């Protein structure tokens, strides 16, 4: 079965020169091997010169001097640069500058890709580093004309206000939290600037309502907020519009400011329009005029960004490619089921969240991630690291059968001297792996493919695929967003993706939202400006493209768990958010909030390019190519270490050369390899290429990322111009086929200080005597205090920190509790002297209000816990006194059944409730069916006087549970009271038996079979 | 340079049959391949029959039927048993039964080992299961005649008393503690039976002093103590005497009991003497008579234990062997430095011990290991597991360069199709590993070697060595003690080991102590009775061999740390204990106390047979042999899994046979291999060998312990009888060459309850706003309580228990602390409402009495902490106001130097204990007082000076205090914590810079 379908279009990538320029440069067709000579004939190529100019203006100036014949001092460093760019212009399809370009194709019944005469169109635009220099300059002068909004990242925490990264930053301050004080005039500003205010309109209101007299005090105040980016002006362009520069000119035209600058920007816009029409190689002088004019307006290092479009004549591929890729995804998703814990840090974080907050609350995203008021971030987040000493250990738990399979594959490959390992469908089927569930399949993806034709002599589309060095991406659209200004109809592309996303998810519960973010170092944002079609937008440190009706704020995002998976909800909308980011922003370097919102959008989905064998082979210096059918998934690879290569920074060439030839002979390294960083394809039978090799080896300390990969050395290239071959990469986007409380964390209702109506004691060192201490000591003392009316009620339960303890909670007034504490000390000293305990502590009681039904019902649940304590004490005593001889399993079963009977869950439901969560251990059938039958009044149990004692104890608890059950059903705001019933059953088991998960599981199984067998009697 | 020297002697081990009996049974020289005929011929061999009789009387009875010509039921099961025993009699030197024997050799200038005609002596003696079956019967009938002692394993905990393993146990009970109530008449008996007492003398004291009037009450009391083994009778023999049965016959003569039993025991003793005189094979009829006599006295499964001595004529080996083993030990101890954390679980336990008890306390062994009053055992101990939910993840931290070295070795071996990997001294020297220290080299060891002539051509001692399957032992004499009754002069062997141990350790402080333990399942102890020459003995559940002067009791042992290594000490002796166990008792199944005492004796020593490459190759299904010079360190090995042998329990033979022949060719498995369990050497070219293979493989589910190892296929055997080869194994023992408080844990002095004169508050949620919370809020509130005289003093510090918090401690009376608690509540609510904290708790204050000098000086240290808190608040406030602008590093250095100066540690010591203008304290910090900033700083610090001088003089005045520099170091660590919190890097920097500045000032001091 096919799991994915294609979209309407795909991306084509291709370098500017054919492969012939590469082989011809290594003297393929000419005897000359002079160091210069050819070096002059490459610098006479105008397309090579213009490509260098747009990328590195320093290296350009050296090439001019070289053609002038001037002495160039380094020359060594000069050759390395020229060689590396000549290679990168012929061999690396990845699009950058003018070295490589992009185009968009369509699926067809045949493959044909061709170049037109009018190949290569330029798309130049201003760099964001340059634009934002002008924005700051203007608003630093003319702010009285501007309109301001509050920064949507703001968080207000007590008397402090915060932003997600440091602004107006300081080396003495970035060592800790940086914040402004939330003074009353700041809180007034926060309400006025909510949706934009004119500067003069804001100023006079503050001067009015605070009198001040000194006008300069308010000007100085507002300047601080603007300079620290708590206020954002209208001039700053959105990243989500199609043209940031046109936006800025429009805004300065609305303000009617700096009229001389408006003309200069218009002239720059016209010069830039002229430059984009010049063909490649003709633009050199035109670029320098524009670059000089822009440098005269704002002096920054980057100024211009340039892209180019291939402008192909034909651009069709045989849709057969989609049937092949669907085969690959099946085997990879099957293999993904062998890893049991693929995200160990996020999985640990769920346990911390549940232990703090339970299942029934939604928590503010910014509170939750805070170190002081939250639980902090996951332990692998490096922005504001978690300051707690938590355990960082992890294990993904690979299946030992799959570890064996790949190790036998490796051994057989070495023994037979095979350069590749092949996996096969029927070999994987024999592994007996668990099948993937549909909800775990990822909803869209992108894969990068190099395509070569396997034989022209068969006159057929026999294609060989290699997965590209970057593999792909986790969502369709991320690779395309960077080129939205080059697409003919970008809105129609993203509307399709948005429609298919909405089609795959639950209707009416979800809305789509885009995340947009401008970092402090704005060079990084030049790849982060893109179009989108999500309904809502959250724009941080920038103006948004959306109207204020569709604007979202970080302090409005609440996080919850459902089905053990995280979701995000907007409180103002009361909608769940489906979150998108249409660009290749790296999550691991973003602030923790953005990284977390990225992570949870992929929660419980498989990551398709996380390969199982990666951990099996991580220690080998050599790995064969891994392939499936006609896909090469990973290339053949070699790496270098201090054992196999013996190199120092004091080592020298010729000495390295001898040492490296021994490596090539020992490991079989072929003539062509990639050096897997930015140096790429190296020809080893050429001494200048080994000079690149040694310089990298020696900077990389002879180990660091010195990884060699084989070249794609079979098949032939599919893209041709006349007779010249071009190397070509496809990006294929795929979409999944569809298969049919307001109580705050520190409210005084939730958290009770010591002696604030409750005294909460932890008793340590109890494990050897737990049952005698409960049944005798605690029972007598607390039941005496109840009769003297000193306390109204108590309950206890057993827990584990490191070390086991009893938790004992007493309820009264603060006055009465402080009055008796001296007698509690004497009591606990007497217990210690007998050796029954070691030490104790007093703690804050944190009330689980939402779990037991809200602020009304938890008062009744705390009475239910009081009566269940008494019954437990009485059962433990009668058991110790020998008054009956039932096993622990029988007492558990009877207690569970008596709970459901008194809570009022009718028999038709009971079995299904005790299911949904011992077959040969039922062999006591007659005993269990006799005892668990509640009919008449436990008639089968009352048969023996031992059983009569037992039921007369349990019935002390009955009437309060009935009352609690009726109120839970009487409440219309509470639903699935079966979750409340389940919670109180766990606590009774804890009280009687302690922590034993297998024991509790046994009691619930062993009682579903007796209730089932009583079907004929109900 | 040689690290080890030989002892006077070594052990020789040899099977009872020559290897020719193996090849002749697989038709080496025979055309016939019938299963019978040969099956009849071996069953007519008298040595084989008696060997089977001594080991399994069941199978012996089947052999007799088979020779009587009856038809056996199983027959197939009959074949595999006879094959397995014939092979084990021919090929496995490990001594057991009559299958194999032992002898003791001496070193010489040349090797010659030869059998005499008088070979093979029997050494039969009774089994302990039978001895103790008889002992229980007598002490049940005749207890009134016996003398009794307390069980030396006893522990008393509050009102309960406990033993280290369950007695009179119950399957419901064994899951938890089992104990007797320590009632007053028990505590009286515990004093009376200290040195032993007669039953009547004990009974009538108790009856009198408790005036019980009903005599039967005390009888029924003492019977329960005896049945539960809280009392031990004189009849029960020591495991550490030479003959347990002669001891038992002697004690019943002293007691005069049951004289009709005593003559029967004496006659059993006589018949046993005659049996030991019979040659092997001649004894079947005499064994059955003695066996049936003994079974008539006590019916139990085992009854008799038998060994045999080889009685070699010649037994010299060339002393050259000792030089080769020194080379092996050099290269192995060199490799051992590549692993940083080889005992991961015990290192965690050292951290938990430092956390709970610190560096200055000695803790009772049975308290420390207790789950409730102690910290429990290490997390890998299986006898009462640690019930705490700790993280058990562990890592040994192998050096990445050595992993690379071994991985390129393995790749190169597979590529060249080589069957072995060789390690070399110069290759290891290029790894640039750290050098092993002399204190880490283990004091003694034993190594097992199979020895072959590399060739006969020279008639020369060119030897090839294979390390035996069990490798060796951690201590000299562990392999030997099991044969103490067969040695000619056992005391002279064990005396020289004790003397060599006493010579290696520190004089005067140490004594040697033997641990002896009898388990509840006594069959396991038949290998645990041995002689020793240690000065003291601890005997558990048994009588000892020593007088009461030299008896040690388990509740007398205290544990401490020194130099980050554990030691054990006796409180009565006031001596450290050098602990010995001269037998192969497995520590991993012993009670937690015995396992911990074993682990102590090896702490911070290397374990020589823990091979580094064992972790690197653990995932591979084939491994070449690892060798060095002329040692094969590990054999070549293959293992089977569900990928390479697709077999199931439903799989039939023939299909297995075709499946396996494929595996052989793919992996190159040779003709002879060991199946590494109790089936051992297999000839794969023979079909019944394949039947043994498949039978094992099916039960082992095609995975469990199915490891194949190659045979020692080159060289020739060195032991000959005329012209018959025997396989021979040596055990070489070696010894290292020498290179020249009374305050209990729950005393009211130590632990203070909440409001018990101390109020101890932990404040959470504070990490964003420390320094402001200290300098303003805590400062202004607590100092105002001192002015009111509501509290006498306070101090604070910063800690982590996962979450960061402040620890704030206030001192007053209980009545005053309960009176003001409402205002403390109002105070902390206001701090919370500003968002400066989240929640708080009240905790017990556990005072570090021994760290700060004992019960008197601790009261002064707590005043030093009070004045140091005030100075920290003042410095933090002045910094926040900007009254000075020094770096944190400057303030740290000045405070450290001011501490040493005011504590009175002179300059000549300061640079040994650990900018120039500021740290020069001369005149009156005159270089600092020059600026106004420096005058403000120094005036704050001088608030602290007077109390530190007073404290320092009292420390030096108390002659009971030693290394007062540890007190100064402690209080300097606290000052840094208050100002900067927890950052180990920053303090290390601050101290380093201060030392450099003080050293540069030598001309000025």
Author numbering:
A (entry chain B): 2 to 741, 754 to 930, 937 to 1037
B (entry chain A): 2 to 741, 754 to 927, 947 to 1037
What do the authors of the reporting publication say about this deposited model?
Maddinglicin A (MadA) produced by Clostridum maddingley belongs to a group of antimicrobial peptides, the so-called lantibiotics or in brief LanA1. The first necessary step is the dehydration of serine and threonine residues, which is catalyzed by the MadB enzyme in the case of MadA. The structure of MadB in the apo-state was determined at an overall resolution of 2.7 Å. MadB is composed of an N-terminal glutamylation (residues 1–741) and a C-terminal elimination (residues 742–1038) domain. MadB forms a homodimer as already demonstrated by SEC-MALS with a bifurcate cleft-like structure in the center.
Similarly, for NisB a RMSD of 2.6 Å for 1383 Cα atoms was determined. This indicates that the structure of apo MadB adopts a conformation in between the apo structure of MibB and the substrate-bound structure of NisB. In the apo state, the regulatory loop is stabilized by hydrophobic interactions with Ser154, Glu230, Tyr518, Ser521, and Phe542 as well as hydrogen bonds between the hydroxyl group of Ser180 and Glu178 (distance of 2.7 Å) and between the side chain and backbone of Arg229 with the backbone of Thr168 (distance of 3 Å) and the side chain of Thr168 (distance of 2.7 Å). Surprisingly, the comparison of the apo- and bound-state of MadB revealed a RMSD of 0.2 Å for 1792 Cα atom. The only change occurred in the vicinity of the substrate binding site. More precisely, a loop formed by residues 164–179 had to rotate by 8° to free space for substrate binding, while other minor conformational changes of MadB were located in surface-exposed areas of the protein and are likely not relevant for catalysis. Interestingly, only at one side of the apo-MadB dimer a tunnel of the GDs envelope was evident. The tunnel is protruding towards the corresponding ED of a monomer indicating that space is present for substrate binding.
